[PDB]
Write an enzyme that holds these catalytic residues in place. Structure first.
Site, short mmCIF file in Angstrom:
data_model
loop_
_atom_site.label_atom_id
_atom_site.label_comp_id
_atom_site.label_asym_id
_atom_site.label_seq_id
_atom_site.Cartn_x
_atom_site.Cartn_y
_atom_site.Cartn_z
N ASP A 1 0.81 -1.21 0.00
CA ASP A 1 0.00 0.00 0.00
C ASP A 1 0.85 1.27 0.00
OD1 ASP A 1 -2.31 -1.63 0.16
OD2 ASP A 1 -2.01 -1.86 2.33
N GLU B 1 -11.36 0.91 -4.15
CA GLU B 1 -10.79 1.37 -2.89
C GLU B 1 -9.58 2.23 -3.21
OE1 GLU B 1 -9.96 -2.28 -0.78
OE2 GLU B 1 -8.42 -2.94 -2.22
#
Lengths: 534, 535
Positions: free
Chosen positions: A14, A186
């Protein structure tokens, strides 16, 4: 082609990339591992150094009891107004219809300085991002989690203004984008480039359907138009590609006016008896971070070399800056602080868990709870960052009952680990024991017991990892080593093997002591060696 | 006179009975429900009143994040040297090879007084007990948990001296008893009676093979000789008996020199399509506490009427003392303290989850995490204590997004519950929705949405429980009720239905508010009615 991917090896998912002048930063998620958030620093995007772990206090991050792969999900690091802004989550529920978790903001002047106490933003979904609009206004983006039975759980990207004056979200939130048919939309990131707002998102989920999609609008609330060759990043169509799960991207413009994209990826081990198109593989190093080069055409960015990414990428036209190592291959524990590559589970490393001064030149760990406990483990560990390495320690431990054990652990989560530990047997005394937890099924596979003579001050413990398999060895003199002929599969410590709703970390190796009798018996570890190999 | 069993109905397991003069006390386990440990008081062993809940502070009991059916397992209440002693556990791991948990000691002059801060004893196994020897010495007993793959996990009963002066166990622990072939040896209680030390244990596990075994030794460290007609308590052999899972006993000698035994039991609902010999049934009231009479012969105690226990038991020769109720059938929330029959999950009821003063005559709950969270739930609940009852509340709640809901919940654990809640729909506005979690499988079974008009001040919510089935109803005016034609099975909220390593509580009903958007929107509950029937 001088960037070599992945730039962050092992568990580093991430990535949130951020430029400040001629310095570049990348924050990655850390889940249940403490301290939280790892920030890396680079001058040239080729060489990266581990610079800071912002979330160091329980007042910023309290994860005792958090589920496996709860805690700090994708963070967002930015810079504006002379300050770093870090948005992070603490996810408390990772399985079932709900995804309970909360999003917070902390600030600092420098990434390795003291970060503020958290400002609470919202709880409506994960992957929060802070956007600094050219107008001076600030906005928080996040996905909306929908629990309702009839609905897809990813209900779109929410946008809401953040008031610096009031230290809270103001107005009403607005759903600005609902994604594409890949869904699981997302990881929202907003960029203002030229005449458009660009909304970058992840779709497809963080397994092998992962992708990065981009959309644009002249207005911040939309409607957003999707890239005509969407997705801009994905390896879904190429199961043989060395980079997989490519998605969750963030974009940086260098000070040399060049464009790059950071994204997570996995490097799977495959099974020779399965089709790579059906079983894409297993990733014991978890999700790593890679960097791609972008080019622009008709107001849309494209990944240079194709959307599945490249291993070797043309570096920006910037002077090379190599950093010195931030850990030593043999840590003798001569410093009073734990090396920045070590983490503990969920809670701070305090004198109730261990000490670097009680037994000088040793790491002393006080026996606490077992490796299955989400509460208080005396376990200090570091990432597997190569398919080929050796890790080794030397432990002084004198257990008095069978509920005391200490030694060397390879660990994915509370249900998935193996451990070589000095323990106590009522009949043979001090013994060396192999313990295996595989999705909570527990075994002790040694057929014959390994007795430790009373004369042995230190028991030397080693693990040798050779991609698909790893093996433990031990010695009583550091000279004569005995391998334990139990070949362990690295894929059992991987995102793709473990059960449950949270599968977002990676394999760790470290030193551990447990005392499930209550006496908190100490183990003294003389050194920890981590050495990557060919 | 007659004791009518169970004497503690609904979720009230692992009874530790204790005499002080002419007062009788019984502590029971509470697991994740806060405050911890329930102590009941009686004069005559027939009538019991809820007297205290000792563990009121996080410094005594910190259970945030605890697994379902972790926390406070079987406690031990005793009295000596002018004070009560309470031994309890905080179990952090309930599944897999280990059972990580810690045992603590707190003391108080009175059961409803202020209890001390905990002294940490050990962590070597659960069910700790404190034994007060005639010599003045004190000893802690507990079971030993063995994680090792080749071994039975119940490795025997450990004994170790506790130094009152040094506030710690001293010397070394000794395994004094290894159990019988029933195994799963736990719940040790020591008694010195006549010429022997008597060691009482539970065996067989707390499902339908549960039993109480007793052994005796002239010497405290053993060797212990097992009762010739062991076990002294068990319903294993009688699947039709109304008391099941009989075990985990403690013994009291009354001030009238009579002998009694408290033990836990379950009252199962059965399926007509199954053999009770194969499927003993499901217990939505969880494990309850019963009391049996003892008689002695040849230095061994025996349960009067047989080891499977009796529903109606001869009371001691003590003057009757009946107590008035300790809760209001309709609680209007006019008091500033939550009534003692309400509990919260894991954490104290503080201003961060609710208030009795912000909105007078209402219980205000600030929407926090969902019913699946082991962390911070704004959920205030009380036990199912009858197979036949109605519970009802009235809620003022004005949600603005679909992540806000509040209402009436029937709950076993984070994976097993049903809820009738006021929520918000993007197209229809305020609506009434039914949500169902069955071992974490989530459903919303209403076929059509129930729209709530904007003019509606309070939404009245009711559950009617009739043994095997329960059904929700609602009203917008308290006058005309509409039943929701979705029949729920009570057995889905039972120890015997839910999955996982911890299955030790019972069904609750209560008021709840969640706000998974972050705004902590409050719901105001006007009253809570809990009204039982006699079948």
């Amino acid at each position: 082609m001088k960037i070599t991917n992945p730039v962050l090896k092992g568990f580093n998912p991430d990535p949130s990339i951020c430029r400040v002048g001629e310095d570049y930063y990348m924050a990655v998620s850390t889940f249940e591992w403490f301290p939280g958030v790892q920030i890396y620093h680079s001058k040239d995007l080729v060489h990266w150094r581990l610079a800071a772990r912002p979330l160091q206090k329980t007042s910023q991050l309290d994860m005792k009891g958090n589920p496996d792969s709860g805690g700090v999900w994708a963070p967002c690091l930015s810079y504006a107004d002379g300050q770093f802004w870090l948005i992070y989550s603490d996810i408390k529920v990772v399985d079932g219809p709900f995804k309970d978790g909360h999003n917070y903001l902390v600030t600092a002047s420098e990434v390795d300085g003291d970060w503020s106490e958290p400002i609470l933003l919202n709880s409506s979904g994960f992957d929060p991002s802070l956007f600094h609009d050219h107008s001076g206004k600030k906005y928080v983006l996040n996905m909306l989690w929908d629990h309702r039975e009839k609905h897809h759980s990813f209900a779109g990207i929410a946008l809401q203004e953040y008031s610096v004056a009031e230290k809270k979200l103001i107005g009403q939130r607005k759903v600005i984008f609902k994604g594409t048919p890949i869904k699981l939309t997302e990881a929202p990131h907003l960029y203002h480039i030229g005449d458009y707002y660009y909304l970058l998102t992840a779709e497809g989920g963080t397994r092998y359907e992962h992708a990065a999609t981009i959309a644009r609008s002249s207005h911040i609330e939309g409607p957003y138009e999707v890239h005509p060759d969407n997705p801009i990043v994905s390896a879904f169509h190429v199961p043989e590609h060395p980079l997989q799960k490519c998605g969750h991207a963030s974009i940086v413009q260098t000070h040399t006016n060049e464009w790059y994209l950071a994204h997570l990826t996995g490097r799977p081990i495959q099974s020779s008896k399965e089709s790579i198109f059906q079983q894409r593989g297993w990733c014991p190093l978890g999700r790593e971070t890679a960097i791609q080069k972008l080019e622009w055409k008709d107001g849309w960015p494209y990944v240079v070399g194709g959307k599945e990414g490249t291993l070797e990428v043309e570096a920006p036209k910037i002077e090379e800056k190599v950093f010195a190592p931030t850990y030593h291959t043999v840590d003798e524990f001569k410093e009073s602080t734990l090396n920045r590559h070590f983490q503990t589970l969920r809670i701070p490393f305090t004198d109730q868990i261990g000490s670097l001064t009680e037994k000088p030149q040793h790491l002393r760990l006080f026996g606490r709870e077992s490796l299955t406990s989400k509460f208080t483990q005396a376990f200090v560990a570091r990432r597997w960052q190569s398919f080929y390495f050796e890790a080794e320690t030397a432990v002084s431990f004198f257990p008095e009952n069978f509920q005391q054990a200490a030694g060397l652990v390879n660990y994915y989560n509370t249900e998935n680990w193996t451990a070589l530990q000095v323990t106590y047997d009522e009949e043979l005394g001090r013994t060396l024991e192999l313990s295996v937890c595989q999705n909570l099924a527990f075994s002790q596979p040694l057929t014959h017991k390994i007795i430790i003579p009373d004369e042995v001050t230190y028991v030397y413990l080693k693990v040798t990892v050779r991609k698909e398999t790893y093996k433990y060895s031990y010695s009583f003199d550091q000279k004569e080593w005995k391998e334990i002929d139990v070949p362990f599969e690295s894929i059992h410590l991987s995102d793709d093997f473990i059960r449950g709703g949270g599968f977002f970390t990676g394999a760790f190796v470290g030193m551990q002591c447990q005392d499930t009798s209550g006496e908190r018996l100490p183990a003294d570890f003389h050194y920890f060696r981590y050495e990557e190999t060919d």
